């Protein structure tokens, strides 16, 4: 959530990676107790939408130092956890860090 991609390509790639993670978690159609779960009581979902967009705006306002540190960190960390001397995914992590940040998956 904190990391913001710098391109149309990293938007679609990052989106796709996240989708593939959640689809790897749950194959069956029925939603699983826990998970995302925006709705507990009526009127929750809208606040969820609002808090989400606000955190997107603060994710947008960040400094140069913070952004660059977050990108190196996300590239390395997601490599150490999900890239096992595999030049394709090592390449597509170092290339686009927001996909790696989607690959953190925790």
């Amino acid at each position: 959530r904190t990391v913001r991609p710098s391109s149309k390509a990293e938007d679609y790639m990052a989106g796709s990676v996240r989708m593939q993670v959640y689809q790897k978690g749950n194959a069956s159609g029925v939603y699983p107790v826990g998970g995302c779960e925006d709705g507990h009581a009526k009127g929750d979902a809208d606040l969820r939408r609002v808090i989400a967009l606000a955190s997107e705006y603060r994710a947008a306002q960040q400094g140069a130092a913070a952004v660059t540190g977050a990108q190196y960190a996300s590239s390395k960390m997601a490599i150490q956890l999900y890239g096992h001397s595999c030049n394709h995914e090592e390449g597509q992590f170092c290339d686009y860090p927001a996909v790696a940040a989607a690959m953190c998956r925790y």
Binding site: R4, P5, S6, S7, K8, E10, D11, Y12, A14, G15, S16, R18, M19, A52, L53, E56, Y57, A60, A64, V67, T68, Q71, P97, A98, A102
Partner: protein
């Protein structure tokens, strides 16, 4: 399936064609630097056109009482046509603008680094150099029957060099809406008569200068440079290919 919900990034084709996109989020920075830097070049050469402070004959822009605003409408539409290009036209423009900026740089290492570094910045250098110098096609003035004739012939051969196909491309586009044509005709005639009313030494250094652009476009041909020594408006007729027209 886009990752960012709010203000999702949409780099322009020009931004992507160039190396501006980067890890640091430079794309905001580099794109901005180019825009500001480009104006700087234009304001420098507009400072060279009017040293004394009053606007010259070149900057008149309109005789009819509302034709100035028409030029403002036309300038923005022309930039919009510049933005509607395909991929290959963009890379073709960035390479040819690059090489022409380097050939106008006259070997200054520093400048060459800053033309490769800022492709967007170079293109306005080419245009603004050729407008400030006076060695441009708009500023051609024939002075015999044979100059006028060979600007017709030379001009036609240039337009055949630009559109080999029968389809008129984006680059020509005289009008946007109805009644645009007649107004563009009016201002276009006012430009030529306006050029008639320049000062003397400006026209003399324009002639020499158009010859100097003729030598470069001509490159190594005794024939062509012989003709430019015969008639200097041909050097103005050497447009670059990064124009269509």
């Amino acid at each position: 399936v886009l990752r960012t919900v709010l203000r999702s990034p949409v780099p322009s084709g020009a931004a992507t064609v160039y190396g501006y996109v980067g890890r640091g989020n430079i794309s905001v920075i580099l794109a901005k630097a180019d825009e500001y830097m480009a104006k700087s070049v234009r304001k420098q050469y507009l400072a060279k056109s009017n040293p004394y402070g009053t606007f010259g004959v070149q900057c008149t822009e309109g005789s009819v009482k509302f034709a100035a605003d028409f030029s403002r409408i036309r300038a923005l539409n022309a930039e919009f046509r510049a933005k509607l290009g395909s991929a290959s036209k963009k890379t073709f423009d960035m390479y040819e603008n690059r090489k022409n900026a380097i050939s106008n740089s006259h070997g200054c290492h520093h400048e060459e680094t800053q033309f490769v570094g800022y492709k967007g910045v170079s293109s306005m250098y080419n245009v603004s150099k050729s407008e400030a110098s006076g060695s441009c096609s708009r500023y051609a003035s024939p002075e015999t029957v044979v100059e006028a004739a060979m600007l017709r012939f030379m001009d036609i051969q240039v337009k055949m060099a630009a559109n080999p196909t029968g389809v008129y491309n984006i680059s020509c586009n005289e009008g946007a809406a109805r009644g645009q044509a007649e107004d563009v005709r009016v201002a276009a005639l006012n430009a030529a008569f306006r050029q008639g009313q320049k000062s003397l030494g400006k026209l003399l250094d324009e002639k020499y200068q158009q010859k100097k652009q003729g030598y470069s476009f001509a490159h190594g041909c005794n024939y062509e440079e012989g003709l430019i020594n015969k008639y200097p408006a041909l050097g103005a007729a050497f447009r670059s290919k990064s124009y269509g027209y």
